[PDB]
Amino acid sequence: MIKAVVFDAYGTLFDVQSVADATERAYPGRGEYITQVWRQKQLEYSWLRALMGRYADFWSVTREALAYTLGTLGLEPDESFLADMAQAYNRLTPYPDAAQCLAELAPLKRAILSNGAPDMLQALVANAGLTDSFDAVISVDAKRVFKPHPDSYALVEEVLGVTPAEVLFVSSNGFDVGGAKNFGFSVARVARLSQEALARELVSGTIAPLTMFKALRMREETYAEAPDFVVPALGDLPRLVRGMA
Amino acid sequence: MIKAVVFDAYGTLFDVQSVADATERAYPGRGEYITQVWRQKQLEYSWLRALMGRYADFWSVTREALAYTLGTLGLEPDESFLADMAQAYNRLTPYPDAAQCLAELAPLKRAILSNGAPDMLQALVANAGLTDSFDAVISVDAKRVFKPHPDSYALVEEVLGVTPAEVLFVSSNGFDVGGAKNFGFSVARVARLSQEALARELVSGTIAPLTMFKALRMREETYAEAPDFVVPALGDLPRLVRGMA
Numbered sequence A, B: 001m002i003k004a005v006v007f008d009a010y011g012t013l014f015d016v017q018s019v020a021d022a023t024e025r026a027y028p029g030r031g032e033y034i035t036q037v038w039r040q041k042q043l044e045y046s047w048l049r050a051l052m053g054r055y056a057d058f059w060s061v062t063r064e065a066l067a068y069t070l071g072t073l074g075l076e077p078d079e080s081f082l083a084d085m086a087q088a089y090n091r092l093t094p095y096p097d098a099a100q101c102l103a104e105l106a107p108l109k110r111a112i113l114s115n116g117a118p119d120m121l122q123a124l125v126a127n128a129g130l131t132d133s134f135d136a137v138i139s140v141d142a143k144r145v146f147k148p149h150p151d152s153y154a155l156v157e158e159v160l161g162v163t164p165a166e167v168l169f170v171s172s173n174g175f176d177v178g179g180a181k182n183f184g185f186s187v188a189r190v191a192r193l194s195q196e197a198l199a200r201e202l203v204s205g206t207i208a209p210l211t212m213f214k215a216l217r218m219r220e221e222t223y224a225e226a227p228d229f230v231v232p233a234l235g236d237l238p239r240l241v242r243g244m245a
Ligand SMILES: [Cl-]
Pocket: A010, A115
């Protein structure tokens, strides 16, 4: 039976697009671009560092990704600037229905499994006012790998004492849905972009950069096992779990 | 001393853009989009499968990435169509100065180390008429991992019997440059996109797709160790090696 609901953090509980005003105010006219590449390279670097066996925590990864992104524009800000701007990732706005969702899941164990470094996650959750909505906020850091490495998901049992079969893993990220399924969790994917809308957007004329990100990041990955469930929003989760087992 | 020059294949010896006319058929008006997302997802899938510990050779990866890409456009091609169109990757055009480069690099050992599956590389190299330019064409398939996993590079000493220090690794891919430096090779990066041109391109009003691919794929990655050498083209390597020794 499902004894725990484990949440992916970035893109799932928290909007990664919500760094837009900071990236934009900091560099006018370049906000949307930076927001997309920052996230894309943040992911790529987590995968590439882990696959090289050269781990560094998500805070270092987040700042490396930012430096690369600003670099593409011809900017070379010092470490102090990068650390300050990177704080934006610790202030992501939670999705409007995250709190209500977590409230309705109170009977079950509630947790986060994230690539985020310990201090990042704490700040992130505390600033969202969701600290009291979780029995555990788990960082992959202890394992010194990143998703979808199996060791990242092994932490769930270690911390909560529940078996993979008793876990419902929630994520808006294809790669993370694939990792959790591979490891043996039941998965609910959060799909906020309808496939039919993307298809039409991709042919609505000249393809914008924001649509590029969506095309790379907001779909199920073809190499990955399909999720057990797909909901359009977090608020649908409580009800999904009700009529589940 | 440099006893062998080991080349990255895709993007380095072979133009991944040269699938343009094949994709422009799979969907007139969208060949450029497909070309770019296909290559991007092809790379992501190689990283994610390996990191997940669920290897499938580059031929499956190539097809899965193509299916994903076409799927974003709303198409649902069958296996036969995918396998047929994916052949475009075994017909990539070598860069105009590749042959000359390889010739002038003899009698030094010359080899390919590529993510490509064995039959892909053989067909790709044979179509380009470069079979007699290489002492060995090495696929990572033997290790059942993908770059930048260290085992990928370990094959080089196994096949050529040269130590990492005796290898000059050539690649246009920042993640491959990073993995080879990580492993211990000396590395010559082929940088066909000037940083200053990209920076300005990203500032010139609306940002095109190819530009998005370029921003994501044609730079040195910030987490990676820098390459020992950077040249503009393959033809510059023979001279690099000479002035090097
Ligand atoms: Cl993430």
